[PDB]
Ligand binder design. Sequence first.
Ligand SMILES: Nc1ncnc2c1ncn2[C@@H]1O[C@H](COP(=O)(O)OP(=O)(O)O)[C@@H](O)[C@H]1O
Ligand SMILES: Nc1ncnc2c1ncn2[C@@H]1O[C@H](COP(=O)(O)OP(=O)(O)O)[C@@H](O)[C@H]1O
Ligand SMILES: [Mg+2]
Ligand SMILES: [Mg+2]
Lengths: 273, 273
Amino acid sequence: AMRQCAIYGKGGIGKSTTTQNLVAALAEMGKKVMIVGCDPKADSTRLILHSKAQNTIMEMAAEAGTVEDLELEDVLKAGYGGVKCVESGGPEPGVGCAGRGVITAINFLEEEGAYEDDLDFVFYDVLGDVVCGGFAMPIRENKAQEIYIVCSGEMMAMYAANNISKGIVKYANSGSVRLGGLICNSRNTDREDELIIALANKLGTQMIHFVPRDNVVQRAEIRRMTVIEYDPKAKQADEYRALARKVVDNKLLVIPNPITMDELEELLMEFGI
Amino acid sequence: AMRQCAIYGKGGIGKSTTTQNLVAALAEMGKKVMIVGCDPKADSTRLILHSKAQNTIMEMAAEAGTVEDLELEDVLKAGYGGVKCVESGGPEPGVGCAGRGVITAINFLEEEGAYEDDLDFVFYDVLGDVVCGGFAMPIRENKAQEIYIVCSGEMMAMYAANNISKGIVKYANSGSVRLGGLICNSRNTDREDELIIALANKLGTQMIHFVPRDNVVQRAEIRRMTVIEYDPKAKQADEYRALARKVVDNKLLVIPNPITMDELEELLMEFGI
Ligand SMILES: Nc1ncnc2c1ncn2[C@@H]1O[C@H](COP(=O)(O)OP(=O)(O)O)[C@@H](O)[C@H]1O
Ligand SMILES: Nc1ncnc2c1ncn2[C@@H]1O[C@H](COP(=O)(O)OP(=O)(O)O)[C@@H](O)[C@H]1O
Ligand SMILES: [Mg+2]
Ligand SMILES: [Mg+2]
């Protein structure tokens, strides 16, 4: 078996930084992991690959002719800890549906046997500002059974978490996609941990980890590395190791209870944010 | 004539706060303005209307039967300074295309004669994390001739500005949609104004105003008002008045020059962000 997980959240909240560091910690532990980038920004694997980014399936298919002219061994790339990496890509802005590349990529990976039994985890890093097209496909088509939402005390980040949860509820009659937890990627605000715990409880889930804001992230990323590789002794490396451990041990996967806008505002008012 | 403007930018960057305050300042000056909300969050008019939000055209059409059963006088609502307000709405998460309501709304407004000659400005407040579907329609279909992008020193906010600019370039052969400027909505970071000026120069535009981070915004919004209405003497009210004046006087509308990821990273490295 393998655990298929998707990391969702609003743009800029820390999906790719959190995913790549979490996965590096899992690889450091001895797990076999694949990351599938499902965000048009297409830099979801660069810290594993030590790279600028990664050429996308959409780009490589266009240069080869069709996606069938591609071979998996040409598309998947291995980096830190043997983690395997692939980017979906997507159409240029103003052209077609921004999520169309996700559908092409996941189908290609399935057909070509990328989901070999020896994998322990797959992580999809998915744009979450809209829940439609290819960005909804991991939920709609039962590709990621465990959804973890990166958020913060920012109202927009909490709204996004609630919106993603509404999408999970919409497809709960089929497949087995569930909300696994919230990950608070801190903005260094007071009581932020308490706020995200409260939100998770209202949704029916948990806050799986509170990730502190730490400048070591930027110093590692300037050098195209995870904190795990860049400075294994960093306090922030231990934070990502704690997040990885709790993801491994997590057994709570729920159909969430989306809340009203009044509930979100009350949370913010209460915790003095 | 009227000036048709659209405010784009990544989620949570300050589009709705900036738009409603800018428009309040324009109304305070004696201009006649309409705001069209083009973000599924659907709270782009609440500070003009003193409201929780506004019921959307998609919602009202469903309750009436068809969009043709709606009357403009039932849909448009007037608030502070006589500013007229309408919300597009959109499908629930996981269902259909998140931007579909924008197409329905703009077409309804055009057909029903909402664009009366006495209007001086129309502002569309548009989700910008993806540039596709109804979110691209104001650009693709020549609805907003002047695009202003709210951003900040945040890398993701600058990436979004570059992405929106790529969409403008894509449709420059038809219609007359142009980039009018960048608005820096500050994160209280050092040299942020210099950084956004540099980005604007690389794109071929200008930074039309630097909006400071000021807690008076939250105090006004808790009370469902713009800063302009809440505390007309606030320093931040004068900031929005300066932004409004410069939008009124702006004559630079360009086909932008999108930059490479290396250029963005160099900007960030240079200004020590
Ligand atoms: N815990 C953290 N501490 C410091 N910086 C962070 C942290 N998490 C993310 N960042 C920074 O935030 C920015 C956006 O993170 P990213 O993972 O790219 O967001 P997303 O993938 O959700 O768009 C990056 O520059 C990253 O270095
Ligand atoms: N200049 C500012 N100073 C302080 N808070 C701000 C400022 N601009 C925006 N905000 C706050 O940022 C949050 C997001 O702004 P909003 O306009 O809703 O973003 P968007 O419409 O782009 O999603 C709001 O809570 C708003 O009060
Ligand atoms: Mg990312
Ligand atoms: Mg808004």
